[PDB]
Curated annotation (Swiss-Prot):
It is found in: Cytoplasm; Membrane. Residues 10-89 form the PDZ domain. The chain holds residues 67 to 151 of 1544 of the full protein. It is linked to A chromosomal aberration involving ARHGEF12 may be a cause of acute leukemia. Translocation t(11;11)(q23;23) with KMT2A/MLL1. Ubiquitously expressed. Isoform 2 is found in jejunum and testis. It comes from the Eukaryota. This is Rho guanine nucleotide exchange factor 12.
């Protein structure tokens, strides 16, 4: 098939008075570069440099960070299906 681990973990992010702390960057694809340490991101179970599969059951196409940001900000609570395999000792 595709990918190696092929493992995905569901992590719903909750918007606060300040907003989503974690930040993502990627033209075509979508991966989280920074995460809110000890914040909404840390509580949601987000990892730095994680791959984004879909947002709220909606695939992300086209190259436009604004669209992703708008899509994520579209609502306070938005699901973010990411992909990543923890260390291996």
């Amino acid at each position: 098939g595709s990918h190696m681990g092929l493992v995905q973990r569901c992590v719903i992010i909750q918007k606060d008075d300040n907003g989503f702390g974690l930040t993502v960057s990627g033209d075509n694809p979508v991966f989280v570069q920074s995460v809110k340490e000890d914040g909404a991101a840390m509580r949601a179970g987000v990892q730095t440099g994680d791959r984004i599969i879909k947002v709220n059951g909606t695939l992300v196409t086209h190259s436009n960070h604004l669209e992703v940001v708008k899509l994520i900000k579209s609502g306070s609570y938005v699901a973010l299906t990411v992909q990543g395999r923890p260390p291996g000792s």
